[PDB]
Amino acid sequence: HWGYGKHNGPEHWHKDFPIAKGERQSPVDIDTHTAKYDPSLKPLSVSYDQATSLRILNNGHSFQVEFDDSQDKAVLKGGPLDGTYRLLQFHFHWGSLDGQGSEHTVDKKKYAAELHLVHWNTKYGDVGKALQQPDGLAVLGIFLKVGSAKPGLQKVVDVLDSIKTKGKSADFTNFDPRGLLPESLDYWTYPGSLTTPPLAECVTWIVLKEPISVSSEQVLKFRKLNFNGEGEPEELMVDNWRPAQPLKNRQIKASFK
Numbered sequence: 631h632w633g634y635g636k637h638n639g640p641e642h643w644h645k646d647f648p649i650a651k652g653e654r655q656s657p658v659d660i661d662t663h664t665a666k667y668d669p670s671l672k673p674l675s676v677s678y679d680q681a682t683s684l685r686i687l688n689n690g691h692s693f694q695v696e697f698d699d700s701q702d703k704a705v706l707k708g709g710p711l712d713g714t715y716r717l718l719q720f721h722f723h724w725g726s727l728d729g730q731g732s733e734h735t736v737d738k739k740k741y742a743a744e745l746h747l748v749h750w751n752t753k754y755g756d757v758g759k760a761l762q763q764p765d766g767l768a769v770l771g772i773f774l775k776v777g778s779a780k781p782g783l784q785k786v787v788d789v790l791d792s793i794k795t796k797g798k799s800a801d802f803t804n805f806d807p808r809g810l811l812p813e814s815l816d817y818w819t820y821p822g823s824l825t826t827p828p829l830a831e832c833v834t835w836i837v838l839k840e841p842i843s844v845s846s847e848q849v850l851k852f853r854k855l856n857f858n859g860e861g862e863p864e865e866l867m868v869d870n871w872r873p874a875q876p877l878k879n880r881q882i883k884a885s886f887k
């Protein structure tokens with residue numbers, strides 16, 4: 631099955647998931663000088679005041695923090711979006727080394743990691759239907775650089791040993807994802823895809839300009855995760871990122887001058 635190894639990684643995915651070679655794949659390099667400022671782009675609206683986090687799960691690829699998305703509790707609107715997008719889960723991508731790990735790149739710069747908050751469009755009723763639509767999902771992407779700790783990230787870091795292996799989960803209530811967000815909501819946006827199988831071309835990407843800083847100790851905890859389940863040799867969950875894909879016939883827009 632697919633993964634992030636040389637034997638199962640991104641260069642192989644197209645065999646099971648042929649849209650891997652499609653017209654609107656993600657991630658992409660963001661050329662900041664080419665991206666056009668779009669004065670018609672609205673402030674984004676991140677309303678996470680009622681988020682009910684519920685559970686954290688090591689899914690074997692990343693780990694994911696889950697929210698009750700059975701009502702409008704944690705929603706993304708505005709920006710490039712039409713309508714209301716409910717927060718489903720977050721997860722991260724990161725490297726073995728601080729010089730890699732992000733999926734998007736900015737002028738070819740890789741960040742140490744990238745946080746993705748996955749939301750689905752309420753006019754489609756559930757995430758599986760949303761996956762079938764060009765405007766089904768909105769993923770908010772945030773770069774991580776290594777420097778000072780992110781205090782809001784600390785609750786998340788302190789449970790990973792409890793979900794060390796694939797398929798392990800833990801309760802994870804009362805987490806405020808607001809603590810993962812930079813001062814600024816200035817962003818780039820473009821139409822793209824999931825960055826893991828099934829690679830569905832259903833995502834409006836919103837990538838924030840401002841990274842967050844996390845400490846070396848925080849990102850070291852991510853790198854002690856395992857892709858394996860317990861009993862199988864230990865395989866450090868690192869380098870779980872898809873590289874940049876062809877931009878093709880797309881324009882990346884900036885919300886900021």
Ligand SMILES: NS(=O)(=O)c1c(F)c(F)c(S(=O)(=O)CCO)c(NC2CCCCCCC2)c1F
Nearest residue numbers: 689691692694721746748757769823824825826
């Ligand atoms: N980067 S991304 O936002 O396109 C992405 C992932 F990289 C990712 F790892 C996941 S995951 O944590 O759930 C592991 C997926 O194998 C999702 N999650 C969504 C996409 C997967 C299809 C199911 C629809 C909702 C979850 C996912 F959306």
Ligand SMILES: [Zn+2]
Nearest residue numbers: 721723746825
């Ligand atoms: Zn992701």
